[model samples]
Target chain A: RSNGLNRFLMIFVLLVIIIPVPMVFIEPEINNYPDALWWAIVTATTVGYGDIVPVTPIGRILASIMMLFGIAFIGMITSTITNFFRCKKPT
Target chain B: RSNGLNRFLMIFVLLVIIIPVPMVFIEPEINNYPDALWWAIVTATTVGYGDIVPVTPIGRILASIMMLFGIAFIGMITSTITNFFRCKKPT
Candidate 1:
């Protein structure tokens, strides 16, 4: 029922996926494109895993930014689910 | 702005926090109260570090439940943020 919300979510996912480009090329620890993608997904979800973590200072800084992305990204999802079940869906 | 949403979140957090009681006592790997609590938070957040994972089937089941909790919980937060930024706050 909310077009704007849907669009925003689509864009958010796209932006997060796009992050791996710089992550793989610039971050040595990221290693490969696939690993960078993995990092992006893990970091975006905030599940951390710590299996594939960023080691470089620059990578960590960017990862820190990614964590913020997760906070609000998950925050947005949490808020949506809360509203949906709480009988407060946007009109 | 939404008391129902706020209350549900409060209760959800309480439930997730309480899960560690059984987790620590029943799961051999849990080892201690603090670790149990850590597991609860980690699973609830879906940041499954794979560093303190459940070994037993029951523990895994419970963790799977916690994972659902994260999905919907984060989904709820996501929805809320989406609405907030979209100017669709409840009255």
Candidate 2:
């Protein structure tokens, strides 16, 4: 059952990757193409190098939400990875 | 000895997770991808979904650093999880 969920997760990731390009473009004032792409990766990975940040009010709100979500996201990924190894076949 | 490292990492997780919310908002051009959250989870877990990616010159710089750290984070999590089970007793 859990493995089934993982499959969904993999699919979700692919879908997310496919759509976000246009979504970031949804707001032109947010940034130019390069900046938007940069922001996208940094935010998703939670790298937050602090080079190019969100400047608009909505962007700021989203930023707060992202940070909150970032914590949960990390937890999920770690748990999944741990589970993956635990379930692995021993030699 | 390693337990100490785990504790440190736990603290690190708490610190990063706690502080990042406001930091992302400092700049608003970034997408609502909540990449900070997505990125944190993906990068830390080594998932690297590539959905919301980092883009700015500085963000890119930090992102590269994160990819390097991703391996460490995965090792830390896997090790910590195994250590937990190992430290436990048999039935």
Candidate 3:
């Protein structure tokens, strides 16, 4: 029943790993692979941090859309956990 | 089906308003009400920004706990939305 939730999170974790490519290449603040990964993790978690932000227009747009998606993703997982625990055990 | 989500969001919006009290009083960067509100909005939304962060250990702890709670809250809401949409209509 909870497998869907697990799978969804696993994919997003991968996204967190790959998203840094653009961040490192395009975003001035994110100068290297490590920094890009950091930004991606913070962004994926919806913890913007704002320490290393997007300066370019494209970067900002990318970050904005990513943030919105992350919020929805987080909300969906929460519901999964709640419903899982709320499920009644059949006698 | 979605009524619970609507209610949950409303309460959190209120929390976004009230949480600033401590952020303003304790956080040096958030010296005023507006900044505190900004910080709270960013934090609750999981958009930490990092521009205005808690400097003190206590403040950091507070921010850390708050961030964790916000993530859980987001996940809960997401699951609610998913379950609502997944429910089958009675034919």
Candidate 4:
């Protein structure tokens, strides 16, 4: 039942971790692994914070992709909640 | 089929517009209607940007609520797409 949810979450988590790997090297603002990861989380959640922003073209593109995934991740959470409620409803 | 989608979207949009109204009065950073609306959009999308953050406690609470709704909004988008694909699949 939760197979799809698990897959989606796993993919998101992996992407969150993996996307920053490239950013650390490319984004001048991102100096370390943790900084890259922080930016990724902030961007993915759409929290943006603007504390760290992408200056490089490639980094901006990567941020855009991460934003797309972040939207999907949020959507998945709502879907899961809706499904849970539906399951609890009396037939 | 899209009744729920419409309802969700309408509510989200309304909240986006309305939430900022209070912030315009409460948040020191938010001086005008446009600024309040911009902050609302940035917060609701999780884009945060931090260009205009809430300094007051009440403003922060409002921002927190907006974030929760933003997550739900994104989730709804994903659910809509998933349903569309599922409907198109050969049965």
Task: List TM-scores of chain B, every candidate.
Answer: 0.85, 0.58, 0.74, 0.92
How well is each residue in B1-91 modelled by candidate 1, as lDDT tens digits? 6885687688778867787888887788888776676667656666666657888888888888888877677666666666675456433
Instruction: Pick the DockQ winner.
Output: 3
Candidate 4, DockQ score (0 to 1): 0.26
lDDT of 4 by residue, B26-75 (tens): 87778887667666766677776766879899998999999999878777
- Docking band of candidate 2: incorrect
| Residue range with the least summed lDDT across 10 consecutive positions in model 3 chain A | A82-91
Position A16, candidate 2: lDDT = 29
Candidate 2 residue A81 C-alpha distance from true site, Å? 1.9
Q: Which lDDT tens digits does candidate 3 get at residues B1-91?
A: 4586677677777776777777777777778876666566567668767777789777787777667767766666676566663453222
Query: How well does model 1 score by local distance difference test?
Result: 0.71
- Fnat of every candidate, listed in order: 0.55, 0.09, 0.60, 0.51
Candidates 3 and 4, the one with greater lDDT = 4
| Span of 10 residues, lowest total lDDT, candidate 4 chain B | B82-91
Higher-DockQ candidate of 1 and 3: 3
Q: What is the interface RMSD of candidate 2, in Å?
A: 7.7
Question: Candidate 1, what DockQ?
Answer: 0.25
Model-by-model DockQ, in order? 0.25, 0.10, 0.31, 0.26
Collision count of model 2:
29
